[PDB]
Amino acid sequence: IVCHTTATSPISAVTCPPGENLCYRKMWCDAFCSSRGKVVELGCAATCPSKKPYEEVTCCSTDKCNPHPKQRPG
């Protein structure tokens, strides 16, 4: 399991040695917005048995969960 560290444009030392399950990473923003909220994603944790609404992240068990910025997502 891996998780692009920051990504944005270039790239860094990906792969999450610890917590073999999900690589966290979500965002912030106010509400649904879908435009502003210029923030970032966490980055691996261990698991996400939780299921809360507003927080910052849940879990990212993949190899490309890191989405795009807020301003210009695409």
């Binding site: 920051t6 944005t8 444009s9 923030v39 994603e41 910025p69 210009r72």
Partner: peptide
């Protein structure tokens, strides 16, 4: 005590696109 620090962080425009 002046700082004007940024609340949250930012994704785009990191610093390596240098």
């Amino acid at each position: 005590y002046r700082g004007w620090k940024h609340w949250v962080y930012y994704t785009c425009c990191p610093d390596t696109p240098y």
